[PDB]
Design a protein around this ligand. Structure first.
Ligand SMILES: Nc1ncnc2c1ncn2[C@@H]1O[C@H](COP(=O)(O)OP(=O)(O)O)[C@@H](O)[C@H]1O
Ligand code: ALF
Ligand SMILES: [Mg+2]
Length: 396
């Protein structure tokens, strides 16, 4: 009902947050603009829900209308968008170079830095810019806490063939997903490292069978754990994925240490975080983990998913738990509200540890006498009889 109009000069961005209680609708009415790398269509009404934090940027200039109550809304004039564009340009240069030398292996890029420096946002911008160049990069998500590919407690990778949806983010077209089972790597650091090594190995063999994926390269998002044992995760991730480029966002000490340790062929670039990045408390982060899990089963406002609830006999499945090796679980009251991954491993053995998963279900009830559990499931029947425990819980 309330309306706000904004004139954006070239290289400026409108930053706003929808109110606690209401939606905010955004409309580009003149010029060109993009939201984290996805182009906006002239005069299309993009409805953002409450709490949404959004930045619309323009290279040449724009006029933009907001309809609805906003908590905040302003035009910033000095972003690092050019920096983030030049990273894409230099990445596409390496591709051409290696195409002209040739199948060409695309460049691989690791984004690092502490919490709330914009690693996820920059990874999104770079993926989008690659797609708009006509490339299909692989997006690799190592953040088991704040995960934009699958549920929390996963390490995942997806081939990006379309720009992110402005409101909903990227389409998850058949991701490779590994069940780590915890919201931080420190819960079991050696399993975490084993998982991204198996991810790296799987991706290298798969890109051999798909040339477009191969030359698309990789954009690898890490978590904000940069201190202590988080630092060694970074070095081992760089090594395991054989990255060509490390982008450090807003941590000059991390930059300095990485400069001294990484192999000489690795190009390291320090860039600042955007002034629009917002700090998020642990309470907000937990809420976002819950909404991620919710979305996995139910989808979005734009694209609803319709999950099934049904009963499963304990005589038809084997529950197991990593942690470090495999252990067979007895159906218990304490599995209630937990996610379980459907393992691609047919037996509950050593294969389970480094096997990707089909997907997840949520245990909603446990009937011990009847020896049944109620599960929420994206499909009608279980895709596997080997269900692997995750410590991620969700009340629905
Ligand atoms: N330029 C920007 N304008 C407004 N909000 C932003 C901008 N960049 C990032 N954000 C927001 O800041 C928060 C942190 O960004 P994120 O990329 O998730 O940090 P990190 O991945 O490093 O933990 C996110 O909620 C994101 O929507
Ligand atoms: F990716 Al973060 F805090 F570093 F969500
Ligand atoms: Mg992130």
């Amino acid at each position: 009902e309330n309306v706000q109009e904004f004139v954006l000069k070239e290289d400026c961005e409108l930053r706003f947050a929808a109110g606690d209680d209401s939606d905010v609708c955004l409309e580009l009415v003149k010029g060109y603009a993009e939201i984290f790398g996805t182009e906006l269509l002239l005069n299309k009404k993009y409805t953002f829900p409450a709490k949404s934090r959004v930045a619309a940027f323009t290279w040449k200039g724009a006029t933009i209308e907001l309809v609805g109550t906003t908590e905040s809304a302003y035009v910033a004039e000095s972003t690092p968008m050019v920096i983030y564009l030049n990273i894409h340009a230099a990445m596409e240069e390496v591709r051409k170079k290696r195409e002209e030398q040739a199948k060409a292996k695309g460049p691989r890029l690791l984004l690092v830095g502490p919490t709330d420096v914009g690693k996820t946002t920059v990874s999104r911008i770079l993926c989008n810019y690659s797609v708009r160049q006509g490339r299909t990069p692989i997006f690799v998500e190592l953040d088991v806490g704040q995960n934009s590919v699958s549920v929390p407690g996963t390490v995942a990778a997806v081939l990006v063939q379309k720009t992110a949806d402005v409101i909903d983010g990227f389409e998850r077209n058949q991701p490779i997903v590994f069940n780590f089972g915890h919201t931080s790597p420190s819960a079991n650091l050696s399993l975490y490292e084993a998982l991204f090594k198996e991810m790296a190995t799987t991706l290298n063999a798969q890109i051999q069978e798909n040339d477009e994926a191969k030359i698309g390269g990789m954009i690898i998002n890490t978590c904000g754990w940069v201190d202590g044992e988080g630092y060694k995760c970074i070095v081992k991730a760089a090594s395991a994925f054989e990255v060509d480029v490390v982008i450090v966002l807003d941590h000059e000490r991390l930059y300095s240490d990485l400069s001294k340790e990484l192999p000489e062929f690795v190009r390291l670039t320090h860039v600042p975080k955007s002034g629009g990045v917002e700090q998020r408390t642990g309470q907000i982060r937990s809420k976002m983990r819950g909404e991620n899990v919710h979305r996995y089963f139910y989808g979005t406002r734009a694209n609803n998913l319709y999950p099934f609830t049904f009963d499963v006999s304990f005589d038809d499945v084997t529950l197991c738990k990593i942690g470090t090796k495999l252990v067979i679980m007895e159906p218990s009251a304490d599995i209630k509200h937990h996610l379980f991954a459907f393992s691609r491993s047919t037996k509950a053995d050593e294969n389970v540890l480094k096997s990707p998963v089909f997907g997840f279900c949520l245990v909603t009830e446990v009937d011990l006498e009847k020896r049944t559990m109620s599960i929420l499931c994206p499909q009608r029947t279980i895709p596997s009889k080997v269900l692997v425990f995750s410590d991620i819980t969700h009340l629905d």
